[model samples]
Target: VVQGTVKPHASFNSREDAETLRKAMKGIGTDEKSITHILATRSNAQRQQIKTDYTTLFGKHLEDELKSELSGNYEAAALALLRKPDEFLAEQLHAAMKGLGTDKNALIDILCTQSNAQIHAIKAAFKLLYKEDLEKEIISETSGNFQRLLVSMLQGGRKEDEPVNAAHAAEDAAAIYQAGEGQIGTDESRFNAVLATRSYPQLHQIFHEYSKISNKTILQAIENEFSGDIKNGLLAIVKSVENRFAYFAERLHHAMKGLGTSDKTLIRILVSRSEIDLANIKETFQAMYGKSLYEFIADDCSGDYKDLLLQITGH
Candidate 1:
């Protein structure tokens, strides 16, 4: 699942690749076949070098050219692939925070799944690209417990190396029950601290022990005890810990299930996960939903956009 469809090409020639892309979009009808073949086949590092040399050779941003030539999801997906991973995600974060309201789901999806290192990298990329503090932006855009959780997570202070202590895991499980469903009122801060700070293996042990203590899954405890952003955020963390691919599979299902497509979520999850776990996500999507992701998109979307997603997803 960690393996992506595209790999670093040993014989990759950035200038030649850039020329092929430039010619593909140069005149008449856009060479859609050529564009997809080149960009889709090249590794992100290869694509990055192609973009750099594309600018050097053609005196234009490859992204701008793609935007001019492509439209809809196709354009969004292509542009997503062209940027450095952190830069691409930073831009998505900015888009989510722009305008009248914040896209909290997007925020949760990105921040919760990212490692401490990724969170820091995204922070640097956001600051460099947007000339604004990511933390400050999050603070200003959100409020209440959601805001606090996001702020704390942005610090990337999760204890990554904490060994799974079986003894403490039982104690943490009892504490989690006391904090949430076992008590009259939920102690969300405790939930946040445990979910946010514990290492993945440690959390897994806690969750396993939690089921024995409560006779219900940790996820059920969360649903029963919490609501709104905190519920959504914590669930994402736990789900990611339990099964990261399944988390994304569910997210992808959410994006395409309704009348109108969640273009942002679809684009974000598909492109980001494409290089991480799309294959496994595809399997989980099918197992969970009783339908393949390729079929879902094929049924919901039309034209080249659907085709592009299928290609990137390696269907």
Candidate 2:
């Protein structure tokens, strides 16, 4: 479940915010501070309200005005805030698959993290916004076991709730072991079905039993048995199952790692998680890395982008 830091402001007035944003945009120099203060602090629902008011009052799209006024990461962050949450996520998914090489990591991160309902919304938004089928695009970009896994997940029929059954968990664990490390030939289908279909709680139980019987975690077995995108995809599922916040923390760190920043990834996580578990992600990041996510950003990012991100991080 998403744990957002932003809340509906008790004194929120969309008309007032719309007028303020207009004033900020009309002048020779845009009031970056005012823009950031208003939009960054508002919840997604509030922002959409502001958008509606902006257009009704000024006869201009808020996003279009913001796009014309802002630039760089600051612009990206602002525009993200203006979009409906699902539409924003669908745009990210499109960007990940639109270029020369597929960002399979992003594909897996997004697809695996979302609930069935959330994925369905994203797929709908993808079709509406891009006039394309998300599933077809995913299939065209990915191949082999990884492709199958992605396709299955895109079906958005994952079992979300159930009473935990220990016998079933034990059986699933053994099936996983036999499918990979316990057998001569890897049965990719078996691993796919169990990983993609089981409830998170049930899978957690399965992983515990699998560890006791195989002397290795499900992650270890996946690494020892699979290769390439399949390995990465399965690992993502395990990480997400184990801890959603930590999984996102890892993704956030990965975006900021290396020589150049992956602004696409950095922005995606900041905007998406801002209204959904960003605070928990921050806690996990601090615990796992021994530094605050805010400090991490301070070192890696600069200017309005950093400010907007820090605000979203609830600093």
Candidate 3:
């Protein structure tokens, strides 16, 4: 079962929260702490209510005002907190695609990990906000296997039924083998077809089937056959399928590892997963790294930004 750290802030008024936000911002110096606390603690559903009520009373777009009032990583993180999850994701997808070279990792992270239901919502939000087709824009940046894997995901057809008979795991593994290792030239279409369409447990079984049946690790097979970002993208889908908690745990750990923090990745995962599976992810993080993700954040982050993240990622 999955779990999350963030919960609704018991009961409170969006209007009061909105008014509190205005008071925080309207002062000589913005009460950054209050704005941070209110936004950080509230649910995305709550954030939207506060956002709407802010507009109803003040008649100024809340995001626009926040944009003007705040800047830097803090600003970005705060805005991320305010958007509904789909809009946050759609916003991230647009950002990844908008400038210069596309941020391919962001594209892979989003398109690979989100559920079929979410991708559907994300596509609608993307089109509604940008007035462009998601698929066409994807073509503008990516090609071949990576493109097809992403596009295959857009079909959102990963069957959720129970895996019947452990035997089919071997069959599916053999199918993948014939599609890739069995052929002199790998049929990547077949790779995408098998990987994207299988249910959770079945895919897990397929990975095991390869190891037990052919003495081949799934990643090793995927690694040799696919090249470049196509491989990274496909590997991510497999990793996410195998153990989603571990996948995110490592992503967050990498975001904070060694160098200065990758605040974009760090923020996105915490904010995006706060209402989804952050608690589970957090547990896996401790198991993998033997340190509290909470402590990691506290040690690596600073001031208002640190405080905001701390509350949002409650122990």
Candidate 4:
């Protein structure tokens, strides 16, 4: 789970707060819309304070104004982002699982990859909102290796990097790299390095830096560089990397490009990442692939399945 910050910020429970923000936004107002625009993107914790002050002072829910004033995909994504993450995730899951058929990509991208604590909070929210267990829902909707993998993920195993160490990282990376791509096996060193040595924050930076080193991303390097058990190992590391958004990016490509469509992969990524750093991942996907991830899904999928995906993506 991405850790929360400990710092205190301003609250939302005063009229002065609203007036202050309004002035802040339009202080030197010209064509530049700084006030609302800047405040719109504040973190939830910050917004929560703003909401408090907005209501206490104005006698109105600032959240409502935020919901009403924001427009377009950013608004859709921001509003969801603004909500408590668990609630947002729960809503995202409902959106994916609600329609005629399930979207597996959506499921895997989010659920199959979260850390134990994240899954813990998300599961609680799931039960709270729907009185339904996420694990039970997955077992009901899925089967086979996927079912097993999804179950393991939802079961909320150990937070893998709990005992991060530099020596272990190098050793693990070398082994996985060899298993992944080396002559003896696929050189999965990259995989092990990330899983063992890097902290959550470090891993995030690593992935971003990785794009600079290889033409294919860390996800693409894994998928295109190897396959089978070795590839699976690499995938596990990827999945564990800040919620597996990139892995889903790979699945999305598969769903669009071949003889048989990967419907499950499509649904999984769409459903799962809907509430994570999905917006960032979408941005990453477009950066990696010329075409938008949504466009690819559209070309490859149709019917209610496609509709659900668009909803998750706010298309």
Note the Cα lDDT for every prediction shown.
Answer: 0.87, 0.88, 0.85, 0.57
lDDT at 274, model 4: 54
lDDT-sorted candidate list, best first: 2, 1, 3, 4
* TM-score (all chains, Cα) for each model: 0.95, 0.96, 0.95, 0.48
Best-performing candidate as measured by lDDT: 2
Which predicted model would earn the best TM-score? Answer: 2
Q: Over the full model, what C-alpha lDDT does candidate 3 score relative to the true structure?
A: 0.85
- Candidate 4 per-residue C-alpha lDDT over 207-278 given as tens digits, one digit per residue, 9 for 90 to 100: 555555445556776787765544564466566666555565665676667875755445444434554555
Stretches of candidate 3 above 4 Å error?
A: 182-185
What does candidate 1 score in Cα RMSD to the true structure?
1.6
Expressed as tens digits, the lDDT of each residue in 1-315 for candidate 2 is 457777777799999999999998785888888888898888889998999999999898998987788999889988988889889988888888888889888898889777899999999999999999999999888888899999988998778795689999999999999999998899999999998989999989989999889878899999999999888888888899899899888988988999878888888888887876888888999999998998888889888888888877776
- Candidate 4 structure, TM-score to reference: 0.48
Prediction-by-prediction clash tally: 0, 1, 0, 40
